[PDB]
Amino acid sequence: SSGALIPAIYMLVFLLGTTGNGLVLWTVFRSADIFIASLAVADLTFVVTLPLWATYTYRDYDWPFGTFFCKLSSYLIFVNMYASVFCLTGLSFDRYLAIVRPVANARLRLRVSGAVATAVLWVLAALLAMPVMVLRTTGDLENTTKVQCYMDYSMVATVSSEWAWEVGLGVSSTTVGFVVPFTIMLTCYFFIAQTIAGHFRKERIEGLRKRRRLLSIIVVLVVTFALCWMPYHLVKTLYMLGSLLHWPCDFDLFLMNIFPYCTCISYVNSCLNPFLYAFFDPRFRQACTSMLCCGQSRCA
């Protein structure tokens, strides 16, 4: 039943992403405007090379594309996860450097702003996304007579300890891709929220309407990410760990039945990122609307 649902869901997030982040990239061509642009590139690159896996899931084992694309597309989808999480966290730390300590922290924002953070986060993304194409090949399994895309973990290690290799890789990616960046983002936005609550006086006549918009946007900014990138790594490591200690049959089956959906939930944030970071400040609203209405006719 999900065999057509998963591809349709992938297509729905593709249409959404290549629209939202496309418009963001068009309108952005202020500090924290490099990070918006970098975030927009990750969303467009992240969802554009999906229709290949969209078509592939339709048969669940038939991969009607080159062996090479099982390397390029997987490398793109991994480098983009890491770049998008790393950039979004760098964006929150820049906000912290600029809003909590605006006087004593001028030098650090001069050094580790979008000038160096962009290059270093992209370098770390590419450097951590190596084992996704080094170890990934293609094989036509005689048990299905269908050319499937899969990983070997044999091109580097011995098969005698393959369980430890997969455990280590699975634990390491979540630790470097969701644990540290999410903690950093949570700390930065906790301190920015303390500052916003401290500076904007509540005992004012229609002056606190600047205190609920900002606090709400901070809470949404943390919760969207905490509720998108969490179930994926949750189920992933839950399955990779429980299947190794001691597990039943109604647990593992549910995990395998729900993973092709937890891997579709982590693709909606990629589409939400514009409507939370870029089209939230009314500056892009006016410029983007003027640009979208200039050359486009008044009659559909």
Partner: peptide
């Protein structure tokens, strides 16, 4: 059933 979870999605780990 203990299949690899990397041959169904676009993310191996």
């Amino acid at each position: 059933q203990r299949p690899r979870l990397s041959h169904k999605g676009p993310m191996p780990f």
